[PDB]
């Protein structure tokens, strides 16, 4: 079920997920988790270093998960769910169109504002980078959160 064509194929599917689920879905998923995790890791690190202007007073010092429990009350989180959900409904259409025969390759939403992938070759190198950074990010995010659970400390603070 695992073949060379997908980018990033080192051939590692010990549990054989590929055999039961369409690779196009698995890939769209790996990128989507990765793209989210990269942003999450960046945010958790950014949050410790800087906060937006009025934020500290309303939320105080809560960080990581604790901030979420406080954030939901602000409704900052809701706006995030409603807008992100609106993007996702288009994303559901995209997976459906792709699963139905369609041109779009998994993970392609057509966002290249700076025309960075215009060279065909450079795109391939970037694609490998994106899965790899994303695979790392997910591992890191999980770690930062678990570290948080146990130490009650933000990751930059744990380094401090």
């Amino acid at each position: 079920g695992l073949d060379g064509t997908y980018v990033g194929d080192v051939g590692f599917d010990p549990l054989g997920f590929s055999s039961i689920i369409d690779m196009r879905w698995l890939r769209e998923a790996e990128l989507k988790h990765g793209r989210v995790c990269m942003l999450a890791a960046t945010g958790m690190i950014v949050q410790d270093v800087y906060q937006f202007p009025g934020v500290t007073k309303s939320f105080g010092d809560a960080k990581m998960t604790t901030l979420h429990d406080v954030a939901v009350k602000q409704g900052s989180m809701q706006q995030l769910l409603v807008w992100l959900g609106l993007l996702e409904i288009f994303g559901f259409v995209a997976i459906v169109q792709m699963l139905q025969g369609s041109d779009r390759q998994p993970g392609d939403f057509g966002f290249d504002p700076l025309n960075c992938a215009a060279n065909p070759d450079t795109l391939a190198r970037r694609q490998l980078v994106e899965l790899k950074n994303g695979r790392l990010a997910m591992i890191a995010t999980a770690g930062m959160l678990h570290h948080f659970f146990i130490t009650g400390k933000g990751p930059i603070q744990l380094i401090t």
Binding site: S19, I20, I21, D22, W25, L99, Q100
Partner: protein
Amino acid sequence: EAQGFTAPKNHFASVIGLWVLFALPVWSAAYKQAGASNPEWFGVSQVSEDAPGIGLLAKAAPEYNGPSFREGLEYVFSFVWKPPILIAWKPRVYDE
């Protein structure tokens, strides 16, 4: 505050009711004109077709030329008054 045929609320309800009645003619006709019925319109699932528990034929209907419904209820009753638990311990000429 009038009530019934002259009440404001019954009238708002009446317009909502008229929409419900006109919905079936207006939208069933719209659905009849082009509803689904597209080669390009088909459902999709991530799961592979070889995955276990996927039927060879859709909406399968077995003939079941077998014991009548009542006998099956008896088989289900024989579950509780004649299970095969003690046959396993069965022991292994005619006087004239």
